[PDB]
Symmetry: D2
Subunit: 182 residues, 4 copies
């Protein structure tokens, strides 16, 4: 059917003292992203938490030259932010809810996301999380190239700047043919 | 060695009468993209022309909902614009120069670009062509996910608007770690 | 949606004078492979001819060291063998019939086969052609990893090595879970 | 730059009591596979343990119709067999030693193996583990399609029969251009 992808909504990307935080704009979607995730689950959708994870002793990651350390495996920075954490805790062992560690921006890159979606004959991915113009955008581009229909929940994605958030939404709708949802 | 990728610099994307033309901004790079391509070749680089091609009777293409017909196989719209066309004519049988038809925005999607690059142990791709924020950007994202170093020649890429061009260059540099060459 | 994959059933792989011919065992399937292809087409299936296309000099292709030149681009060696040639000629412009050049053994590698199948929401591939233990096997393994259901038409696949043919059929059924249609 | 791939050498695939065991033929390479892994690591190679792992009750897995439950995550069935287990324990935290869960036969499918190899500019993979004609073979075919040179250590891979072991070795050498070591 459909799969909701919950991209990088962690303490380090959202919290005031997060190591790579997008801050207020990211915090602003905390209630919405939790609500839409529960709704998707209620609707029978599959839910995939696709979460940046960096190993401590890893000097071969391109990001190391680009950003300070963040989302370190084994640390609290990788905790989900807001009520979304309660959803995951409550449904940790549900067959329809998945946690996938990732190391690139796209949720598809180096993961088994496409495999799990194909097993379930999912034709549509619904994207939520941060940042609209980076991990959301890269995930959508890979989804497009893999032939998925794409929906993006506008009230449940966010970027550092409104300008970049807007560029990303326009690209998603007008280049990738995604449906932007409330 | 390096490979220069020449992305979609065709009549339909560049020329005044092109079916999906980016117009003056695309035309403005015509001399530079030809020069940089010849230089790369003189310097020992492989050259890959990666060009949008639509089969006439193809209603399963995702772009059908978005754009009017363009770059139709067998038509003059797929002709290379400017002096670039003479470079290709002269090297049509050169084992170091390639023409690859593509159907998605990224030059890697559904093509054998990665295979040809890996055969040659290419570690760096040099991106040129149009549009900076779409086919160039998608190609760069795939390249990043595939572990290539990325250079982008600022004078030999163009977008529909300066704003989009700038979003893309910033993303290439700050998100993908690409070297912007001026 | 179903798709029938017609793998390398060409003069060089089948004919008495073919450059890498499997010989009588491959010729033995000529009527069957034509009939099953026509039937699949009559049933509404998509038909994909996935055909080795090589360059003589190519020291960058690992395969060049392993086998004599075969299926060279521009040569009669790439002609389809038997009545399959008439089928292709008659449907050369049919939206449901495709010709795809390939350079590796698998029909998926470096091609846009997965993309075309996903556009059509194909869930099952029907494999025919040669050789059972090389191109058919590699194509099947890729199809399995990409989440396709797989059928193999026993009367329409062949190898030179009958030992290897049986190994392949056993592997297809017992490892990949393919349906061997007999 | 070389990487040794250690494919599926677990209790469930190897031990007498393993849930999907290949039994004696797999047990036979226990000393050789541990030894060669240690040597590769000594030569400066990267070491990747690529290990079948099934989520409990996962009915969407294609193997569900093919094989009995095996290599269940969180169970002792996924323990490495023989001295190889001591290697992993001792080198768990070593930057050059990796553990990757996989669900298809190939070590590349749905994993980040290609990404990690590319980061390190590895051009050659050295294949060990079981079974020669299934997980080893599929990994090799993926490696070939991804442009890697391939070596296969004959004394540290094994199949259910010599016939299949030999089919796979011949395929690796003659079809994929692998070097048999
Ligand atoms: Zn990160
Ligand atoms: Zn187009
Ligand atoms: Zn061939
Ligand atoms: Zn298994």
């Amino acid at each position: 059917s459909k799969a909701l992808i919950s991209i990088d909504y962690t303490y380090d990307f959202v919290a005031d003292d997060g190591k790579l935080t997008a801050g207020k704009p990211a915090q602003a979607i905390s209630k919405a992203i939790a609500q839409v995730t529960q709704k998707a689950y209620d609707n029978g959708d599959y839910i995939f938490f696709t979460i940046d994870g960096h190993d401590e002793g890893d000097d071969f990651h391109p990001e190391t030259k680009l950003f300070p350390p963040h989302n370190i495996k084994g640390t609290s920075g990788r905790d989900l932010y807001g009520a979304l954490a309660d959803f995951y805790q409550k449904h940790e062992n549900d067959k329809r809810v998945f946690w996938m560690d990732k190391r690139h921006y796209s949720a598809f890159s180096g993961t088994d996301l496409d495999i799990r979606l194909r097993e379930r004959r999912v034709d549509t991915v619904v994207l939520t999380g941060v940042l609209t113009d980076i991990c959301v955008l890269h995930t959508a581009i890979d989804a497009y190239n893999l032939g998925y229909q794409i929906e993006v929940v506008q009230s449940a994605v966010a970027s550092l700047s409104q300008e970049n958030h807007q560029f990303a939404l326009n690209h998603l709708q007008n280049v990738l043919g995604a449906t932007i949802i409330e």
